[PDB]
Amino acid sequence: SMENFQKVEKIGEGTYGVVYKARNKLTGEVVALKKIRLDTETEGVPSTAIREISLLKELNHPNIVKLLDVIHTENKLYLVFEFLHQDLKKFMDASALTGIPLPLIKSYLFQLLQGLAFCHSHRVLHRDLKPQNLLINTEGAIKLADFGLARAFGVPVRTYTHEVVTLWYRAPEILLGCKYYSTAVDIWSLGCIFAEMVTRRALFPGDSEIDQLFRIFRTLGTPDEVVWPGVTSMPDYKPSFPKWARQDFSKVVPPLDEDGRSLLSQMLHYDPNKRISAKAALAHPFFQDVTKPVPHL
């Protein structure tokens, strides 16, 4: 079954399973193989795999990792994906000295927003965007990967799993326990990633849910009824929260120009209803001169 693939090396461990780099011996194609340990007398095919496969087969887009095949065994389940060269996290670390040039930041953001707009349009929430799940190739592309936490949503949404999104990239409506969250949770995440590409550091690196909230409040201001109607009735909202003043965005990501700060602020709006959609973001003036620089790997 896996006779045509030669494993080259282990790549990492994401939401579920294990990812290896492999090469197809007949075609030459390098692939990433996600290997799923299955069994009988346990729970069978894991839900994460069922959702990932069914949704990825639907999602064909240049900024979404491509699922090429599913080799489904009685023992193991293998997902064969196109191979990407590295993750954004590793890229930022390597650009430690240089920094990522604005044209590259802009192209990567524009591309991710196309990827995301495509998911949302197809009723899919990603729910785990972070630099380890954003993969880059040697042609200037960046793609969404690790759809193991994804799910299909309904219109209007009902309550879905609360335990979602890595903490540093987690939206305030999730931290405050809202019974409904939607697409705006993925935008909040990409907004933090936009900030991080520029400053080369996490915007909100909290180590607990309350630390995370307080770091967001110190940056964006403690939200009240005026900024966000309903916040004070939210389940984990506390009237004892300190009341920090909002900071000017020029101070939040100093190298960013006015259009950039204007986009960032819209992607980090507290009220998930007013937070900009990926689709609408593509038409933001920040992208007026966007190109696709090929990165210095």
Partner: protein
């Protein structure tokens, strides 16, 4: 959050056509009949109530069962095995906290073993080519609900009840698409409760009119009128609960005046 509501509705309209079961498959099934399918479907309603499963889960299970039986011949003593695996897959796809495999073995009062349930899971996945994110009557209703003015909880619950009834009888509901059944159920519910009709705004959204909904609607009206007498009664029982405003005991209209 409407920025994608029409993209999504469009895409589901495309996918219901790709995920549609074959309309005449029961005539190609040697050993099972529409009536054995009803019993299975009625038992799944009970299993969903026992485990407090989402309605969406049940609608997806049924879709899985009808698509599998469209290509796979199954003996009567195995049909519940197919149904158990389908409910397992649906719960995994849709539920925050799905029942464990052992709960599914138990619900069949040990007619089958875990190993058979898990092997059937694998075969359903293979036959459906892992294509589990199917549109359902429920997903369409929930969007149509947004067009009410004002929202009426009874109209919503009654529309859900009617759509659920449609899952039970393959003759005639397999010939109709989810979006169309949802149209008929919403109109029938809205009419029963409020006197009002399929709104103009849903004509603009769906392209469906009362004339195009007619055939499904006459079928659904009869089903609604005969529900207290049908051999399967679990949906009628479920919709007596306060969670669904007791809608199953509203009186159906005697005529629709179309």
């Amino acid at each position: 959050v409407p920025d994608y509501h029409e993209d999504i509705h469009t895409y589901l309209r495309e996918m219901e056509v790709k995920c549609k079961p074959k309309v005449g498959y029961m005539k190609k099934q040697p050993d099972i009949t529409n009536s054995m399918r009803a019993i299975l479907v009625d038992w799944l309603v009970e299993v969903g109530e026992e485990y407090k499963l989402q309605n969406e889960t049940l609608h997806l299970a049924v879709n899985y069962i009808d698509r599998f039986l469209s290509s796979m011949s199954v003996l009567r003593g195995k049909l519940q095995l197919v149904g158990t695996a389908a409910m397992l897959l649906a719960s995994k796809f849709e539920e925050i906290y799905p029942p464990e495999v052992a709960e599914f073995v138990y619900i069949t009062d040990d007619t089958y073993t875990k190993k058979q349930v898990l092997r059937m899971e694998h075969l359903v996945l293979k036959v459906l080519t892992f294509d589990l994110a199917a549109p359902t009557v429920n997903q369409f209703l929930t969007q149509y609900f947004l067009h009410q003015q004002p929202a009426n909880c009874k109209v919503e619950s009654l529309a859900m009840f009617l759509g659920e009834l449609s899952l039970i009888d393959a003759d005639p509901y397999l010939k109709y698409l989810p979006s169309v059944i949802a149209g008929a159920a919403f109109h029938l519910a809205l009419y029963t409760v409020t006197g009002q009709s399929w709104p103009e705004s849903l004509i603009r959204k769906t392209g469906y009119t009362l004339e195009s909904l007619k055939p499904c609607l006459m079928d659904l009206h009869q089903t609604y009128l005969k529900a207290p007498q049908h051999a399967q009664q679990s949906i009628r029982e479920k919709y007596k609960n306060s969670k669904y405003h007791g809608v199953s005991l509203l009186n159906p209209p005697e005529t629709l005046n179309l």
